[PDB]
């Protein structure tokens, strides 16, 4: 289930069922969420 959370649309799917996930990549280790 963490695997299927790699894409934004999948994260949208999961958030409907009360499961959090990380929304940033590893390119910069200090990411701001917009």
């Amino acid at each position: 289930l963490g695997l299927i959370a790699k894409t934004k649309q999948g994260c949208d799917i999961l958030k409907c069922h009360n499961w959090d996930a990380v929304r940033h990549s590893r390119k910069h280790l200090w990411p701001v969420v917009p």
């Binding site: 200090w30 701001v32 969420v33 917009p34």
Partner: protein, 272 residues
């Protein structure tokens, strides 16, 4: 030339049009300009003109100009340019200031000697808080501790009022972060009001009203002393001081606490 450049920059920042190379050309002026006014107005027009920040080609120029005016606003000697550029650094670029270098430059700017910059920078960072805790939060906590320390051990009224205005802009700019630390704030301030320049009282009242604003139903155990002290200030008001703000505070609490009808009997002289 001095009138020419100033007039041209003011007009460029003044009227509307529908330009992209002029700001890239603008790097020539203030980096080497020793005339204060042209640098200041170039800063104004460059801060103003590049608001639409969306297409995937022009981020380079806006990033470079951001670096340039941030460092200039950090560095130049006269405080007027400091204040004037800091004023231009409003929310209009809020979602793009979140680069790490910008934040470290802001932390450097956060502590200086003159106080208008104090207020403006602390407001800016407080607005900046909630979208990226990772950098700001530790420095914020140190600050908050520090302001508490002046507010209580400073034997000088000037520092006390200055810390109070700090606190006010903090509470205004940080909606959710200040919530967990309400108890020490309110208790220190209320003990300050019952102290055995009255502008300190003005600012503590403004701040405490704002704390009432942010906090709903969490001031239940402190409403009584607040009421007694406020109406003591109002009833038999020895000085015709800043009443309108005092009334605004007194009104603010009830609309938030949900404290509605008891005062008219338990403070019978209130209505008249």
């Amino acid at each position: 030339d001095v009138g020419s450049i100033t007039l041209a920059l003011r007009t460029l920042g003044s009227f509307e049009f529908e330009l992209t190379q002029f700001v890239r050309h603008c790097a020539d002026h203030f980096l080497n300009s020793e005339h204060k006014e042209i640098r200041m107005e170039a800063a104004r027009t460059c801060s103003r003109l590049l608001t639409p920040s969306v297409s995937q080609t022009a981020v380079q120029v806006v990033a470079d100009v951001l670096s340039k005016l941030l460092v200039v606003g950090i560095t130049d000697p006269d405080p007027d340019i400091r204040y004037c550029v800091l004023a231009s650094l409003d929310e209009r670029f809020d979602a793009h200031l979140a680069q790490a270098e910008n934040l470290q430059a802001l932390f450097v700017a956060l502590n200086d000697q003159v106080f208008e910059i104090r207020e403006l920078a602390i407001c800016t960072v407080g607005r900046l808080s909630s979208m990226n805790p990772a950098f700001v939060m530790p420095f914020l906590r140190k600050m908050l501790i520090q302001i508490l320390t002046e507010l209580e051990h400073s034997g000088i009224g000037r520092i006390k009022e200055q810390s109070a205005r700090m606190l006010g802009h903090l509470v205004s700019n940080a909606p959710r972060l200040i919530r967990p630390y309400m108890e020490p704030i309110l208790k220190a301030l209320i003990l300050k009001l019952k102290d055995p320049n009255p502008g300190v009282i003005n600012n503590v009242l403004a701040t405490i009203g704002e704390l009432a604003q942010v906090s709903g139903l969490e001031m239940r155990k402190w409403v009584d002393e607040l009421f007694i002290i406020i109406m003591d200030m109002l009833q038999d008001s020895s000085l015709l001081a800043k009443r309108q703000v005092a009334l605004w505070t007194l009104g603010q609490l009830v609309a938030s606490t949900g404290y509605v009808v008891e005062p008219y009997r338990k403070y019978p002289t209130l209505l008249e």
